[PDB]
Amino acid sequence: GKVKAGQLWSKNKEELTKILGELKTELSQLRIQKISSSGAKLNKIHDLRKSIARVLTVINAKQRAQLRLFYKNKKYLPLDLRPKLTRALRRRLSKEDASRVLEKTKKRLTHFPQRKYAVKA
Amino acid sequence: HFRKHWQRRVRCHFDQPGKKVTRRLARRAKAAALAPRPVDKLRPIVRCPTVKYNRRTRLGRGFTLEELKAAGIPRLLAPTIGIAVDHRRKNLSEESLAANVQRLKDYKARLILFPRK
Amino acid sequence: RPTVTVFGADGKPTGATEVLPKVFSAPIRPDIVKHVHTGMAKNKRQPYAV
Amino acid sequence: SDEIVWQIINQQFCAFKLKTTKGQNFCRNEYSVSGLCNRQSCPLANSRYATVRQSPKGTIYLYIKTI
Amino acid sequence: MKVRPTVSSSRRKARKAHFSAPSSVRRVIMSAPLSKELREKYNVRSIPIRKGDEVQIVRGAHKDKEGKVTSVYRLKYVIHVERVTREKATGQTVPIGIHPSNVVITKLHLDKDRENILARIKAGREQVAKAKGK
Amino acid sequence: KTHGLCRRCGRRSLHNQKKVCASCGYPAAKTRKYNWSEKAKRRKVTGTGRMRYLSTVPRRFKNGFRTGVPKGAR
RNA sequence: AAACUUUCAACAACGGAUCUCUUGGUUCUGGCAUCGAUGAAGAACGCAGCGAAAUGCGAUAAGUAAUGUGAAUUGCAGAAUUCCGU
RNA sequence: GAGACCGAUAGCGCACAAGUAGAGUGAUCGAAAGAUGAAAAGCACUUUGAAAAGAGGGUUAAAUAGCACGUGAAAUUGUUGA
RNA sequence: CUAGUAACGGCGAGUGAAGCGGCAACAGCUCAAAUUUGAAAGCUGGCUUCGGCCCGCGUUGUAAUUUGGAGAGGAUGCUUUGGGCGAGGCUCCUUCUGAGUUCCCUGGAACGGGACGCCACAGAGGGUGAGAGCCCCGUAUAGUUGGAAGCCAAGCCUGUGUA
Ligand SMILES: [Zn+2]
Ligand SMILES: [Zn+2]
Numbered sequence: 001g002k003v004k005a006g007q008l009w010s011k012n013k014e015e016l017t018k019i020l021g022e023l024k025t026e027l028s029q030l031r032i033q034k035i036s037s038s039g040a041k042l043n044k045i046h047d048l049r050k051s052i053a054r055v056l057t058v059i060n061a062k063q064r065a066q067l068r069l070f071y072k073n074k075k076y077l078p079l080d081l082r083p084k085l086t087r088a089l090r091r092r093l094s095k096e097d098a099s100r101v102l103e104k105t106k107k108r109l110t111h112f113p114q115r116k117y118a119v120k121a
Numbered sequence: 122h123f124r125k126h127w128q129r130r131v132r133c134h135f136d137q138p139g140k141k142v143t144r145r146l147a148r149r150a151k152a153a154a155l156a157p158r159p160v161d162k163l164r165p166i167v168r169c170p171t172v173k174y175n176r177r178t179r180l181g182r183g184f185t186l187e188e189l190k191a192a193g194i195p196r197l198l199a200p201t202i203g204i205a206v207d208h209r210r211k212n213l214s215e216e217s218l219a220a221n222v223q224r225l226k227d228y229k230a231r232l233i234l235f236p237r238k
Numbered sequence: 239r240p241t242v243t244v245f246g247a248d249g250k251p252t253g254a255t256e257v258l259p260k261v262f263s264a265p266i267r268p269d270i271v272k273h274v275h276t277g278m279a280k281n282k283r284q285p286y287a288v
Numbered sequence: 289s290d291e292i293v294w295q296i297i298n299q300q301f302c303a304f305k306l307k308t309t310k311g312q313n314f315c316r317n318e319y320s321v322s323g324l325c326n327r328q329s330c331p332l333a334n335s336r337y338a339t340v341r342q343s344p345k346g347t348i349y350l351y352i353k354t355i
Numbered sequence: 356m357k358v359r360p361t362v363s364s365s366r367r368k369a370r371k372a373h374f375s376a377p378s379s380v381r382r383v384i385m386s387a388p389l390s391k392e393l394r395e396k397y398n399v400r401s402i403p404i405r406k407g408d409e410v411q412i413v414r415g416a417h418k419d420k421e422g423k424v425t426s427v428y429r430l431k432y433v434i435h436v437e438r439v440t441r442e443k444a445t446g447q448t449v450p451i452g453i454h455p456s457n458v459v460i461t462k463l464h465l466d467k468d469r470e471n472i473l474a475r476i477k478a479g480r481e482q483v484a485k486a487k488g489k
Numbered sequence: 490k491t492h493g494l495c496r497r498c499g500r501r502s503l504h505n506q507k508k509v510c511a512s513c514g515y516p517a518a519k520t521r522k523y524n525w526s527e528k529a530k531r532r533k534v535t536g537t538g539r540m541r542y543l544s545t546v547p548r549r550f551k552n553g554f555r556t557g558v559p560k561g562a563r
Numbered sequence: 564a565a566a567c568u569u570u571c572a573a574c575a576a577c578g579g580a581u582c583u584c585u586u587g588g589u590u591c592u593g594g595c596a597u598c599g600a601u602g603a604a605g606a607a608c609g610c611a612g613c614g615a616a617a618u619g620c621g622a623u624a625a626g627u628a629a630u631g632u633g634a635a636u637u638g639c640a641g642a643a644u645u646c647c648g649u
Numbered sequence: 650g651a652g653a654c655c656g657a658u659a660g661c662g663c664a665c666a667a668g669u670a671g672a673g674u675g676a677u678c679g680a681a682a683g684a685u686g687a688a689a690a691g692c693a694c695u696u697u698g699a700a701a702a703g704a705g706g707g708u709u710a711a712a713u714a715g716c717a718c719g720u721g722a723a724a725u726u727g728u729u730g731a
Numbered sequence: 732c733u734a735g736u737a738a739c740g741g742c743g744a745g746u747g748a749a750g751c752g753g754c755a756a757c758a759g760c761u762c763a764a765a766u767u768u769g770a771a772a773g774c775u776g777g778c779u780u781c782g783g784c785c786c787g788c789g790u791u792g793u794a795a796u797u798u799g800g801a802g803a804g805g806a807u808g809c810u811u812u813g814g815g816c817g818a819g820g821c822u823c824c825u826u827c828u829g830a831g832u833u834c835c836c837u838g839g840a841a842c843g844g845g846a847c848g849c850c851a852c853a854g855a856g857g858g859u860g861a862g863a864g865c866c867c868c869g870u871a872u873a874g875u876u877g878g879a880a881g882c883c884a885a886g887c888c889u890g891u892g893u894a
Binding site: 360361362363365368416431441444445446447449451452 | 691
């Protein structure tokens with residue numbers, strides 16, 4: 001009835017898509033014969049539905065990880081793979097751009113930085 | 122003088138004890154960053170403008186360039202050792218000059234400086 | 239009275255005495271205390287409105 | 289300062305004072321000759337005082353307070 | 356009294372949190388003292404109850420009645436004990452609710468997580484006694 | 490009938506002849522809102538519906554808008 | 564003489580005051596700064612055996628993955644589903 | 650996190666199905682409604698009979714606490730007695 | 732605070748500042764105006780073996796130098812540096828940390844009364860069958876287990892160009 005996700009992550013792609021087909025054909029055949037005496041078949045349907053979700057999650061996570069391996073050198077990630085954050089956080093200046101300073105300003109900080117001192121009583 | 126809507130624009134001050142705690146925490150937060158340094162920068166001794174307050178004397182904004190050079194403090198070093206510098210003010214008399222280059226000389230005696238790296 | 243006796247940790251007199259300060263000889267004014275305490279007890283109060 | 293002590297007790301507050309609506313006031317102090325809050329029989333206001341009390345063994349004692 | 360600003364002395368916020376608690380923190384509330392023998396051996400005072408715990412009722416109309424836990428009802432803050440039951444009108448016997456604070460645990464239901472709970476309380480109780488002693 | 494169903498706000502406030510909603514103003518890009526009706530503002534304001542995406546924003550800020558997975562996860 | 568009406572008392576009604584309670588409101592203070600074309604706020608349609616004038620979710624539909632805890636859920640049916648254990 | 654605040658005709662319109670139910674062509678207008686008991690142990694079984702109802706009997710410390718449910722005022726009403 | 736002052740006013744209604752002074756907080760800078768002219772030294776994209784190659788912008792001006800209580804250029808002599816790791820620490824979440832269910836009475840039920848104890852840097856609060864410090868969660872205090880992201884940072888590798 002239920003399939004643990006621990007067995008799900010170990011298998012490869014063709015084993016997933018065969019098992020997903022096996023759960024889906026089973027799920028369809030239940031509801032045809034679940035309309036009469038919906039007892040333990042209804043509990044099986046709930047367990048069949050949850051196992052379908054766990055299988056569909058592993059296929060998507062494996063496909064998304066394969067995409068992120070493919071685009072590891074390219075600079076234009078697809079929109080579905082980019083981080084969400086917020087809207088305003090995505091238009092903020094970069095950490096290196098906002099830390100960038102002029103050459104005149106760096107010259108004054110190099111040669112006259114803030115010192116460390118104290119005043120006695 | 123209640124011709125306009127003074128009901129909509131009345132401000133109480135029940136945060137008076139709470140703002141004092143924040144202000145004292147801001148001074149403690151500042152002193153955590155500047156741990157051996159004093160919190161406030163050094164300021165010059167200046168005379169109050171008008172005829173009413175000519176006899177009184179207060180702290181100004183920053184030291185004049187002639188005051189810094191007479192004391193022996195370079196201009197570009199003074200903001201980095203706690204001395205505020207005012208380019209707008211002028212000296213205009215030897216009494217304003219001598220009082221402040223005594224103050225900066227007294228600052229240097231009580232100042233301990235640590236090397237860069 | 240000039241002196242007040244100092245008592246030990248066991249409750250017995252130690253043998254040292256202290257001079258009573260002049261604040262214990264001050265006037266006792268119930269009208270003053272009541273007036274100050276009425277306004278003093280108001281100073282902790284926290285506002286209410288509808 | 290026995291008169292000053294009476295002015296605080298009588299006019300302001302006493303922990304031993306019982307007030308009734310029957311016109312007389314009562315003193316709850318166990319060292320009072322008469323349980324009344326008048327000046328002549330206050331154990332507090334009177335620096336020198338006397339009272340009579342009974343022990344549960346049955347002995348009657350005379351209690352004398354000096355200033 | 357309370358010191359830390361995150362702590363609240365509100366009866367309203369306390370009563371709301373007790374009666375709207377998740378079952379994870381309902382478990383900690385639903386905890387019972389251990390017996391004198393169990394205190395002197397595990398060096399642990401109080402653990403939450405689970406289903407397999409043999410227990411003894413020491414408060415209420417069912418005092419001095421001993422048995423195993425049958426159910427830990429967290430929604431009504433109730434444990435159920437074997438043979439502590441009453442009859443309905445129909446004659447059907449229903450479990451009687453005892454709060455976990457009215458019982459003393461006689462025998463634990465031990466699994467790997469339970470020894471880890473018992474070790475962590477013993478480690479802290481030993482540490483502070485050593486810190487207070489020396 | 491003077492008014493019909495409005496696609497935006499779901500009320501029967503869309504004028505049939507003029508094709509402009511009396512409650513939200515559907516052909517207009519902006520939603521109709523006036524400051525002289527505080528009751529009408531609180532009837533359509535944020536928080537009176539599902540809050541389907543905006544409910545998720547407070548938790549992600551608390552974690553610093555982090556991305557990734559916990560260390561040693563399957 | 565009955566009945567009818569009036570007053571009082573006991574008992575019984577009607578109604579929800581009074582006392583008590585409070586997962587609600589009101590007001591003040593403090594820490595922090597985060598919606599949307601990567602499709603928001605809002606509007607519907609659906610997902611639970613019996614369900615709403617609730618809540619959660621979106622055809623993976625009262626939810627899936629991952630981490631932590633460590634033995635439940637519970638109004639009734641119902642689960643060889645899980646107890647030294649991914 | 651708090652309070653010399655209010656305590657269900659109060660306090661936000663809403664302590665609860667509350668911007669809900671309902672009204673209007675529409676803009677908009679917009680309520681009433683908390684409390685059994687420690688625990689449902691929420692009255693089995695017998696017997697009237699067509700019912701949101703009785704008489705027995707039972708649970709409970711209590712049922713003159715029976716999901717019309719803490720206390721149960723007055724207006725108003727019935728029966729009995731003078 | 733100035734101050735219901737000055738000022739303006741069917742000089743009626745009235746309206747109505749600011750400077751000085753005591754405080755809170757403090758921080759200063761970027762261009763255009765110049766010829767780099769002994770060398771567009773600058774920048775956006777694309778392809779990328781990630782190392783460095785092309786296109787384009789741009790002389791109708793992109794770098795460096797300068798911004799008027801300044802500055803430039805010579806001369807002279809003293810004084811200053813630059814990168815990369817990084818133990819560890821701070822903030823915040825988490826795990827654990829005191830003591831009666833001793834005897835009697837009322838009670839449906841002790842959480843009440845009486846007797847004898849105990850803890851307390853914890854007698855705030857809530858639950859538990861009635862007023863519970865010691866039945867349960869918590870609360871006080873320092874520690875302690877694990878983790879997240881920022882910041883700081885002891886030290887340790889290198890530096891260089893007539894910059
Ligand atoms: Zn007296
Ligand atoms: Zn509309």
